[PDB]
Amino acid sequence: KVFGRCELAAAMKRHGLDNYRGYSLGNWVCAAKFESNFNTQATNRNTDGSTDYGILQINSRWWCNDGRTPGSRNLCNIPCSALLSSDITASVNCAKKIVSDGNGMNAWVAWRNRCKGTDVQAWIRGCRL
Ligand SMILES: [Br-]
Ligand SMILES: [Br-]
Ligand SMILES: [Br-]
Ligand SMILES: [Br-]
Ligand SMILES: [Br-]
Ligand code: NA
């Protein structure tokens, strides 16, 4: 599923991601934009053999199981395919675990490089929340 900007913001708010660990809704929408372009089916392989999955490109090296990342962990205890669903629940629950791991949203390199320090409120500007 390819979300609309305000549609995703609404969905993220519903699952309690807005202001989670102090990160406002615009930070999460912006992260999604640059990680996946709002596409829940996005996948990307990394040089180390692991793979990033879903709307927030969650990495199989640590967080999910995809059956082909040898040294990896499954810290959210899910198949990586669950992060590709139309329904963003698994992605939101896993992101909440990631953002609490110590490094905040810096875990997402696109957030750090393309959202951090910017006017992230723009990403939910105009939405009915
Ligand atoms: Br957009
Ligand atoms: Br594996
Ligand atoms: Br949803
Ligand atoms: Br980047
Ligand atoms: Br915001
Ligand atoms: Na894994």
UniProtKB/Swiss-Prot annotation:
Compartment(s) of residence: Secreted
InterPro entries, per database record: Glyco_hydro_22, Glyco_hydro_22_CS, Glyco_hydro_22_lys, Lysozyme-like_dom_sf
Keyword Cell membrane: no
Taxonomic lineage: Eukaryota, Metazoa, Chordata, Craniata, Vertebrata
Cystine bridges: 6-127, 30-115, 64-80, 76-94
UniProt keyword list: Allergen, Antimicrobial, Bacteriolytic enzyme, Disulfide bond, Glycosidase, Hydrolase, Secreted, Signal
A single GO BP: killing of cells of another organism
UniProt main location, coarse: secreted
Tissue: In the egg white and polymorphonuclear leukocytes.
Name recorded for this polypeptide: Lysozyme C
Enzyme class: hydrolase
Any one annotated GO CC term: endoplasmic reticulum
Residue ranges occupied by any C-type lysozyme domain in the UniProt entry: 1-129
Catalysed transformations (reactions): Hydrolysis of (1->4)-beta-linkages between N-acetylmuramic acid and N-acetyl-D-glucosamine residues in a peptidoglycan and between N-acetyl-D-glucosamine residues in chitodextrins
Binding locations of substrate: 101
Active-site residues, record numbering mapped to chain: 35, 52
Additional note from the record: Lysozyme C is capable of both hydrolysis and transglycosylation; it also shows a slight esterase activity. It acts rapidly on both peptide-substituted and unsubstituted peptidoglycan, and slowly on chitin oligosaccharides.
UniProt entry tagged with the keyword Cytoplasm: no
Entry's family note: Belongs to the glycosyl hydrolase 22 family.
Subunit relationships: Monomer.
Function comment: Lysozymes have primarily a bacteriolytic function; those in tissues and body fluids are associated with the monocyte-macrophage system and enhance the activity of immunoagents. Has bacteriolytic activity against M.luteus.
UniProt GO MF annotations: beta-N-acetylglucosaminidase activity; identical protein binding; lysozyme activity
EC number: 3.2.1.17
